[PDB]
Design a protein around this ligand. Structure first.
Ligand code: MG
Length: 244
């Protein structure tokens, strides 16, 4: 219903260069009705809101949060995405099984949601505990994925849940064409975004994992910005002739 669907990662992409962030937001603010804006972050909705207060993030149309587990718009959680993630999802039994692992301790309630069961691995425990949990869960027909990061954090999420999938869902939901979509990212975790049928911008400060993906699979739709952080988004908007 608008000219552009702008989907951007937050940390180290939209955020990182405060001056550039302000320049980008002032520009977009004067043409607000011409594009849909979605922040796609690994942060929980609450954490994303805290970052908004921290750096003054402009209000987006959508928030793709918590490893794609929850999509929010100003009036609430998107129910179609929720139903999609709920299909064959069994949070109670998964939580009950994971709770049984002495080496796993539940993360704060702030990090939990209907489609995300999170834990902390005991620093004195062995990662094989995660192998055991993962193998056990694969012995079931439950579409769950186990994500172990930083050698301490454990997320149990629907297999359907991730940033790229949430982005693809949003794109079709809003009926926006690939040529009208622009994804922005910096890390290996943003590769899913770039697998979206859309134009994309890789910020200059991108992590090697994303750069290696770009060098091998990137095509005409993927712009290697000269500028870093938010500056790369302004650069890409001009490059792809958006909002002109
Ligand atoms: Mg990032």
């Amino acid at each position: 219903m608008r000219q552009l669907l702008l989907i951007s990662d937050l940390d180290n992409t939209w955020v990182g260069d405060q001056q550039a962030l302000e320049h980008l937001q002032e520009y977009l603010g004067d043409r607000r009705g011409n594009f849909y804006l979605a922040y796609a972050t690994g942060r929980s909705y609450h954490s994303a809101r805290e970052l908004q207060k921290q750096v003054g993030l402009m209000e987006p149309d959508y928030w793709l949060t918590a490893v794609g587990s929850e999509i929010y718009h100003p009036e609430g959680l998107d129910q179609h995405w929720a139903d999609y993630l709920s299909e064959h999802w069994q949070r109670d039994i998964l939580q009950a099984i994971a709770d049984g692992f002495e080496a796993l301790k539940p993360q704060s309630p702030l990090e939990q949601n209907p489609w995300k069961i999170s834990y902390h691995l005991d620093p004195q425990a062995c990662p094989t505990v995660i192998d055991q949990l993962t193998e056990m869960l694969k012995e079931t027909g439950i579409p769950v994925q186990v994500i172990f990061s930083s050698g301490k954090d454990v997320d149990l999420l629907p297999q359907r849940s991730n940033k790229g999938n949430a982005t693809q869902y949003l794109q079709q939901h809003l009926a926006m064409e690939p040529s009208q979509t622009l994804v922005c990212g910096d890390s290996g975790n943003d590769i899913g975004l770039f697998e979206t049928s859309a134009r994309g911008v890789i910020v200059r400060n991108a992590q090697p994992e994303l750069l290696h993906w770009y060098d091998q699979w990137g095509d005409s739709r993927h712009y290697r910005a000269q500028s870093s952080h938010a500056g790369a988004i302004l650069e890409a908007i001009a490059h792809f002739d958006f909002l002109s």
